[PDB]
Amino acid sequence: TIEIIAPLSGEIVNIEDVPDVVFAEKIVGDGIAIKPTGNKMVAPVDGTIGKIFETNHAFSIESDSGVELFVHFGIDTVELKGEGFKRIAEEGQRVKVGDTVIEFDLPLLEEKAKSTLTPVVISNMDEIKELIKLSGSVTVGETPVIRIKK
């Protein structure tokens, strides 16, 4: 196995429960969603940061193990135009579990974003034999959220 650690704290929610078609319908990948309860978006895997949305609310990352994931803060967050998010990492940077990628203002975003539901999805499902989704409360950079068999 490969294990995916929480990129942010909160409660695990099912992907299907996110009020967005692209995510609920697994169009991008399968995974879990987290209802945030904190203030930083950390690396869930050991690897290399891929992309960082100019609005700083989403990023990708490819693990050393060949796992490609995408983390997206909230639904329609692009509206905020960047407000509420501070980018700590750089596209390309090599990181380790627990490493800070983005810092965010939870109370602001919470009052001005359609949703704070954060999808954590596996972009390369086809490389994926088994996907196990855990549940419950998770804490940033520690608690495992998903387990995959390559």
Add this chain to the structure above:
Amino acid sequence: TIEIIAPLSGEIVNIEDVPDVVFAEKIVGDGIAIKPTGNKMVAPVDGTIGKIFETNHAFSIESDSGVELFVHFGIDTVELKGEGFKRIAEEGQRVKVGDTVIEFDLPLLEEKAKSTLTPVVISNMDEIKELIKLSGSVTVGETPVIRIKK
């Protein structure tokens, strides 16, 4: 055949005519879209309700016949955050054609939603040999909107 009855009244529009890429480009499935003219979103098939958006503007349903459909009210409706929609059914509930799923305020939604165009799409196209799209005016729980050959 399997036949899909109108989940809401109005005029049938083509999927391709919905000003949303995910829908117009058939990324989720193929189907028709309806320009609503009434106030309730009903079950189009006999079956089991799957998912209900927390914003109450969209739902899924799997027919007994193995047809999986998704009905989404308007474009970007998640903005409304629930305003305008009353949920009559429960995730999991077993329903029959004509059974009420959601009640909505047509004049409010009409004045505050990007679009009221309602996509009715077949999520499991791959199980689908033939899809026939009807046209014209449809009336809630009565008029057939699509016909499929499994």
Add this chain to the structure above:
Amino acid sequence: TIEIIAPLSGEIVNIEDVPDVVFAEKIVGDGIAIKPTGNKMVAPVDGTIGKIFETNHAFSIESDSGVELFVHFGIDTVELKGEGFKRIAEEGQRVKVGDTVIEFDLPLLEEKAKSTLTPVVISNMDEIKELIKLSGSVTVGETPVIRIKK
């Protein structure tokens, strides 16, 4: 080869750089994105106009050579509800490179749209053996943006 000419001026940006999941993640097709610098959206290929968004901010077109492309102005442009866009062409019309499809108000759209990033994507990738993406500054109806091998 088949070559795709700029449907609008500006700077070529990578698809992956567009702050929208559907586009960044290549869910609709692959291509480039342009940061506009002008005022008209022109035909990139010789062919037949397919679809025009009712909000006039996006269109499709199928080249005589079998290339199917989709051009979408900005991110979430459907909000504007049409403001800022003037439609010069008709669904179905046969056009030639450089032919005007839509006229747009750059300074207005620029102040009221989430983004002006314009994705130019190839919808029928599967028909595509090679896709080459050029870079730099492009000028409406002249500069080639992509080159494909069918």
